[PDB]
Design an enzyme around this catalytic site. Sequence first.
Site, short mmCIF file in Angstrom:
data_model
loop_
_atom_site.label_atom_id
_atom_site.label_comp_id
_atom_site.label_asym_id
_atom_site.label_seq_id
_atom_site.Cartn_x
_atom_site.Cartn_y
_atom_site.Cartn_z
N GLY A 158 17.31 -22.78 13.78
CA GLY A 158 16.96 -22.08 15.11
C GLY A 158 17.45 -20.57 15.00
N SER A 180 18.76 -23.52 7.51
CA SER A 180 19.14 -22.25 8.22
C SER A 180 20.38 -22.30 8.78
CB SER A 180 18.02 -21.82 9.07
OG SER A 180 17.90 -22.03 10.53
N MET A 181 20.47 -21.93 10.11
CA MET A 181 21.82 -22.03 10.80
C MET A 181 22.31 -23.29 10.69
SD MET A 181 21.98 -18.88 11.64
CE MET A 181 23.70 -18.88 12.55
N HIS A 211 17.88 -21.17 3.45
CA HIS A 211 16.91 -20.14 3.60
C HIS A 211 16.93 -19.94 5.34
CE1 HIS A 211 13.26 -18.19 3.62
NE2 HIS A 211 12.79 -18.65 4.31
N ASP A 243 12.57 -21.23 -0.18
CA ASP A 243 12.71 -22.38 1.03
C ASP A 243 12.62 -23.67 0.53
OD1 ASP A 243 9.97 -21.91 0.30
OD2 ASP A 243 9.27 -22.42 2.32
#
Lengths: 188, 180, 189, 185, 181, 182, 191
Positions: G66, G95-96, G120, G169
């Site tokens: 996010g 991601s995060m 990614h 990704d």
Amino acid sequence: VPMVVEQTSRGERAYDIYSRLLKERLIFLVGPIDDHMANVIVAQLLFLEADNPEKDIYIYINSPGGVVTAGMAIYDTMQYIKPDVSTICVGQAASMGALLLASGAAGKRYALPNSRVMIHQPLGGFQGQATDIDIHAREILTLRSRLNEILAKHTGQSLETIARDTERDNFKSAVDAQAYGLVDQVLE
Amino acid sequence: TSRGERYDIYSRLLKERLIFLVGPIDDHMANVIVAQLLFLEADNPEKDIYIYINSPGGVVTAGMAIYDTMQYIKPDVSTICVGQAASMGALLLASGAAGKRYALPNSRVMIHQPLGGFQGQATDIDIHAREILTLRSRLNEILAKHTGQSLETIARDTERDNFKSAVDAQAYGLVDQVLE
Amino acid sequence: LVPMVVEQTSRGERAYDIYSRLLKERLIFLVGPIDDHMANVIVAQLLFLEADNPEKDIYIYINSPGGVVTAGMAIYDTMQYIKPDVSTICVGQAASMGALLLASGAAGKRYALPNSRVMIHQPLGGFQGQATDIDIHAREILTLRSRLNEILAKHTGQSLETIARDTERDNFKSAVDAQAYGLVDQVLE
Amino acid sequence: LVPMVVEQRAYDIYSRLLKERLIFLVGPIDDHMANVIVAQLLFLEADNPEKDIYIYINSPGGVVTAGMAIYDTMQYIKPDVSTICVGQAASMGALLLASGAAGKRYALPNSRVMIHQPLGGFQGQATDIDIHAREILTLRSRLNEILAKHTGQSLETIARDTERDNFKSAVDAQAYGLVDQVLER
Amino acid sequence: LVPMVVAYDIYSRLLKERLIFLVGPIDDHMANVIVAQLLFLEADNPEKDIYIYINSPGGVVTAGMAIYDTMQYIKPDVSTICVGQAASMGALLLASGAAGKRYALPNSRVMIHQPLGGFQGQATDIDIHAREILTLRSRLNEILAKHTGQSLETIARDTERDNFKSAVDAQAYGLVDQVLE
Amino acid sequence: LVPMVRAYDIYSRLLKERLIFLVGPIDDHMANVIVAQLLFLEADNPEKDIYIYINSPGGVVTAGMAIYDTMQYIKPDVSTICVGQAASMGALLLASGAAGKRYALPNSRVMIHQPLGGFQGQATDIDIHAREILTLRSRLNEILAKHTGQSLETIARDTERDNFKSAVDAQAYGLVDQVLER
Amino acid sequence: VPMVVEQTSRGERAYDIYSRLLKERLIFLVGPIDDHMANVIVAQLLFLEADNPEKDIYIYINSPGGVVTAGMAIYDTMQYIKPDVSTICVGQAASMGALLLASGAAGKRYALPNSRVMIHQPLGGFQGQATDIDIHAREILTLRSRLNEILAKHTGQSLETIARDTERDNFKSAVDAQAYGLVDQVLERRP
Ligand SMILES: CCCC/C=C/C(=O)N[C@@H](Cc1cc(F)cc(F)c1)C(=O)N[C@H]1COC(=O)[C@@H]2C[C@@H](C)CN2C(=O)[C@@H](C)NC(=O)[C@@H]2CCCCN2C(=O)[C@@H]2CCCN2C1=O
Ligand SMILES: CCCC/C=C/C(=O)N[C@@H](Cc1cc(F)cc(F)c1)C(=O)N[C@H]1COC(=O)[C@@H]2C[C@@H](C)CN2C(=O)[C@@H](C)NC(=O)[C@@H]2CCCCN2C(=O)[C@@H]2CCCN2C1=O
Ligand SMILES: CCCC/C=C/C(=O)N[C@@H](Cc1cc(F)cc(F)c1)C(=O)N[C@H]1COC(=O)[C@@H]2C[C@@H](C)CN2C(=O)[C@@H](C)NC(=O)[C@@H]2CCCCN2C(=O)[C@@H]2CCCN2C1=O
Ligand SMILES: CCCC/C=C/C(=O)N[C@@H](Cc1cc(F)cc(F)c1)C(=O)N[C@H]1COC(=O)[C@@H]2C[C@@H](C)CN2C(=O)[C@@H](C)NC(=O)[C@@H]2CCCCN2C(=O)[C@@H]2CCCN2C1=O
Ligand SMILES: CCCC/C=C/C(=O)N[C@@H](Cc1cc(F)cc(F)c1)C(=O)N[C@H]1COC(=O)[C@@H]2C[C@@H](C)CN2C(=O)[C@@H](C)NC(=O)[C@@H]2CCCCN2C(=O)[C@@H]2CCCN2C1=O
Ligand SMILES: CCCC/C=C/C(=O)N[C@@H](Cc1cc(F)cc(F)c1)C(=O)N[C@H]1COC(=O)[C@@H]2C[C@@H](C)CN2C(=O)[C@@H](C)NC(=O)[C@@H]2CCCCN2C(=O)[C@@H]2CCCN2C1=O
Ligand SMILES: CCCC/C=C/C(=O)N[C@@H](Cc1cc(F)cc(F)c1)C(=O)N[C@H]1COC(=O)[C@@H]2C[C@@H](C)CN2C(=O)[C@@H](C)NC(=O)[C@@H]2CCCCN2C(=O)[C@@H]2CCCN2C1=O
Ligand SMILES: [Cl-]
Ligand SMILES: [Cl-]
Ligand SMILES: [Cl-]
Ligand SMILES: [Cl-]
Ligand SMILES: [Cl-]
Ligand SMILES: [Cl-]
Ligand SMILES: [Cl-]
Ligand SMILES: [Mg+2]
């Protein structure tokens, strides 16, 4: 909606932050004025009067104004109850919010240095809020004059001055509001 | 909901026999007010009850439920107009115990009853013309009784969808005293 | 917002909503449109009060425009079965199923307030299927309509033919006229 | 209204009646309400595996597998599960009514019972599930066999009569074997 | 779900330690809750420091000014810590903490730029006119100049571009006193 | 409406007896709640069995895998009972209970088939690519083969069809150990 | 959300299941990362540190990622506080979420056998979440480099390796995430 818990003689009791400040006779008048928020403020004023009719009450005002008759309900309650009702403008006070600010106990009306006050009363505040109510032109003119007379009384300005200035939808600074008689002192 | 845990502000004032009639009148809020009236009577049938009224009116039969409960219960029910009272709100204001009906100086009272209050609120109910005329007459008779005005005067004046000031409402017999 | 009354118990405070508090005095509120959800809560309240004391009267205050027939019948059957007398008081109005339940209170203990109004007429809406996959067919509607008429004739003392003719009319009776018709026993004035 | 009572601790009215081994099966049958009923049945069994349990049924029916979850739980647990029809019982609601302990199935005088099982109850409730024709026919047969067992009717009679989407009165439901007794006082 | 600890929710528990969270867009509703918390903590103990942890993209100017005036009036020093980001009114309030007690975390970012949206009327019947906007923009620049030590024209130049400063660059600019590492 | 029994809700009452309900579509929210319940019960008593009652059409694969990994890691045996139905991830978790302690009720139904929906990205910014789907499908088949005793080739063939097995047929297939009757 | 009730000296005290696990220094990072949920996690981290600055804290991560700055708020808090913050990937971390997973205390980063990790960072995480904020290209490039530097530091991979691989990704399995340096150990069996 933060809470605070106090340990009393009968256990621990929880308050939300606003109810906790109500314990110290602090009322918050925040957001648009309508029937719902006006009646809760009236309820708070009456509660504090019965709890102690002698100690001052404080209303902190940050409001763009709103419904005239709802604001008048607060005004009449402030004037009737025995305690002095001190008013403090934080952020802004417009229309009915500005009127209620100016209607606090003499000598006990305050504004913070960056607050702003607009006495202008837009049409929206006078119109019927219920589907089946149409507020007619003459009733609007009567209410507008009544509000102007209240402002003239509490500010010391003449009726003609209030009537001229309320047409303009401009804000006064805290210093300018103090000079105009809308508050007694800028808190610095 | 200005609230403490383990009353909200309204429930706290209910402990002092104060009821708030606020907002549009409908079945849901009328039944809550009826319930409060019955509770306070059982708790103490001798002490006065106070209804503070700030309402634009609403559903006629819901208002009649409040009216009948106010009249039946033993305690005197005092009424105070704060802000405004219209239609059924105005009727209920005028229907408080004689001598104990009050208005604040900047409150306003309109007895006019719009059509909306008489129409069916349920999907399958159509309120017919003759029932509307019967209810309108009944409301006028209730107002005439409590105000002291004649049936004409109520009937003529209720057509006008205008507000009376607190002073004018007192002179008309809708309240007994302006609290100033 | 539903008001609370809170009482102090042995180790602190104990809160009721206003309706739960009145339930403690055997008072039940039948308010708003009748459907399965509110009918089952009323059935639950009736059964609770019977178990708490099967001898003492129960009171149902009725302010309702009516609604779903089978939901109302669930209340009717529960009122008749439980041992306590179930007294009924019309406040505001009682129509369709609300009027039937009003008329079905214990004999001698059915009341109306002076400005209340009663309509026995049963609109089609109350008989139709409430679930998506249920279609209530014509003959079942006619059977239910006759059953309701027989219940009203029994409790009012009117003849079946009188009920069937009058239930046509989508008119309200005043409290006095409802008393004269046998829908309530007494107008509380 | 979610009315409250306090006992010597606070309950909602349904939770209070659960303390007396009373379960309410009300509204459309789906996974959410069926699992709550299963949980209540298991709770009451552990609290006392000997005393009868009572399910009061006012339902238009609903999802077949959700109803089957309730059925299997009723049959497995040790206590007799008595069933009482209030208002109406259709489709899965009628099946569960008929599946109470023998001799302990009741209907109130103005209740009504419809065994008919509409297509809607068999279709997939999840987005990615399509319930295929043969599975529907299998489920319909199992439901018919369950009704035949508990009613005493023949399988052929159930299969013919369940096609009709008509309600039976309480007395007719008793005569058909769907309940044991109509409660009248 | 907001976790509880023993009973408080996590935010109420941290309020007991004089910690206030200023998170999300600034508007009247959240500003008044923060004002209420500031006043509560002052009355509970007018001498102990108060801490405001700021993670906000900014928002309504007058709502932020309500927080600013309350921070300045009450006796306790109000320490400010930037976590995540501080923009517009968020950046102003961060810069307005007690001198020496303004902090940023290493990956925080600060943007003083004030978009038009913050000055416009939020109420239906209020139109905020051009000259009032210019007055408020000027006041905001003067507040930033006072607390950062930058000159008024420097603030006026830099607030025009809607770029973020890193924690190190915000410290060098005078928006915070120290990067916490 | 959830009934009460302070007041517990009915599910919390049953959690005190080491009963967990896996009901409805499987997603991150309900999977994390089940993981939290499993870890709580392990810490409360790492020796006593835990019971998961399963009535689910399946759902998100990675959420189900979170439940699977937690079931396998914790010390207590995790018994599984199929009530109503268990499809896709629900069927996998049913089959993944402690050996000898996997049960089905007589009218419950089990479908191992894994629809595409369970593999697709649930977040706005995530696209689950074809090769990742094929990898997950293989991983699920290997889990089913291991716990059922069927060959990998048998699982791969049978999972293709979106058909339910009866409780008896699920028992014969190795998806549960016993059908609970009486 | 289920409840667990513990008996006190005055009767019963109730927790939701997450608050009960918080009492054992367990934090759940679940769902999309945004300001609202990040601030709750920061609040929990600070509470646990003050309650006991010596004992480890555990964050269980099941998240698709996010908002970048919200995740950075969590990252900075994890690094600042005295306790070691152990991270466990359950389900997935993207991601995060993957960055925070990789940022747990050295030696105390775990993945479950069927979990998956994707470093990614999609564009969506860098864009302004407020109406009046537009995140400009150079700020995006600065943040992307900062995230790459954080991953290189905690994984031991070179900056060039992180920058190349992050474009893709794709998910790594738990074993492959361990080999890459994103976690220290796959929890395969309970000892
Ligand atoms: C919080 C628990 C107590 C509730 C507070 C009520 C209250 O202050 N009402 C105002 C009237 C009022 C209402 C309103 F909504 C707005 C407003 F501006 C004014 C009031 O009259 N206060 C009385 C004290 O209260 C009362 O005597 C009774 C009992 C109390 C439960 C509520 N009574 C009333 O509402 C009214 C009807 N008061 C009176 O009966 C007396 C008698 C003559 C009429 C007005 N009254 C007073 O003004 C009394 C006389 C002495 C001082 N004197 C109040 O302050
Ligand atoms: C919290 C516990 C008490 C709740 C108050 C109920 C109440 O006051 N009902 C009104 C009827 C009524 C209802 C309504 F919604 C609106 C309305 F205008 C009037 C009532 O009749 N009050 C009685 C006292 O209450 C009762 O006797 C019983 C018990 C109580 C649980 C409710 N009873 C009733 O419903 C009615 C049916 N009461 C009676 O049977 C008695 C005798 C027959 C005529 C009606 N009754 C009375 O009026 C009695 C006579 C003496 C005092 N007398 C009430 O005021
Ligand atoms: C809070 C605890 C008590 C709750 C009240 C339940 C109750 O009164 N049910 C009605 C049935 C009923 C349900 C309904 F939804 C609507 C309706 F009109 C009637 C009932 O039968 N009452 C019994 C007393 O209750 C019971 O005996 C048992 C146990 C109790 C936990 C609930 N039993 C029942 O559900 C039914 C099955 N009752 C019976 O078993 C007995 C035996 C023969 C069948 C009917 N029964 C009775 O009528 C009993 C015999 C003596 C009086 N007699 C009731 O009033
Ligand atoms: C409030 C806490 C208790 C909750 C009640 C659970 C319960 O009754 N489960 C049913 C299984 C079941 C589940 C369901 F969703 C629907 C259904 F129809 C049946 C059950 O098996 N009951 C057991 C007693 O419970 C248990 O032994 C254990 C422990 C308890 C925490 C829940 N156990 C179980 O889930 C299952 C696995 N039970 C068993 O292990 C035993 C051993 C052989 C397999 C099945 N078992 C039984 O049926 C035992 C044998 C005789 C008593 N015997 C039950 O009734
Ligand atoms: C028990 C809970 C206390 C809650 C704290 C309220 C508070 O600090 N208000 C500020 C005014 C203010 C309001 C606001 F919304 C924002 C803001 F930036 C400032 C305040 O004036 N504080 C006083 C102490 O408080 C008071 O004296 C009274 C009583 C208290 C219930 C709240 N009083 C007030 O609202 C105002 C009106 N204070 C005063 O009456 C005094 C008298 C001279 C004018 C203002 N006052 C002060 O400045 C007092 C005297 C010197 C220090 N001095 C405060 O700090
Ligand atoms: C209510 C308080 C306890 C909550 C239960 C947590 C728990 O069981 N986590 C699993 C890891 C796990 C998490 C998950 F979401 C899914 C899953 F499948 C597995 C766990 O590791 N259990 C440990 C006991 O817990 C711990 O030692 C610590 C402390 C506790 C507060 C949470 N620790 C952990 O998260 C991890 C990091 N555990 C460990 O540090 C130890 C050390 C070696 C690595 C993993 N560990 C264990 O396996 C320990 C050693 C002996 C068995 N052994 C557990 O059961
Ligand atoms: C349950 C109540 C305690 C809540 C914990 C707050 C806390 O740990 N804040 C971090 C700052 C921080 C905030 C954040 F959102 C993210 C982050 F990564 C770091 C902190 O500074 N901790 C201090 C202890 O806390 C404090 O000293 C005070 C009081 C407390 C109510 C919160 N103080 C602070 O906000 C800051 C300003 N701390 C300090 O004043 C000291 C003084 C030097 C600068 C920063 N400080 C510290 O780092 C102190 C000194 C030694 C270690 N040292 C903490 O752990
Ligand atoms: Cl008309
Ligand atoms: Cl038909
Ligand atoms: Cl098909
Ligand atoms: Cl695919
Ligand atoms: Cl995803
Ligand atoms: Cl990009
Ligand atoms: Cl750009
Ligand atoms: Mg295990």
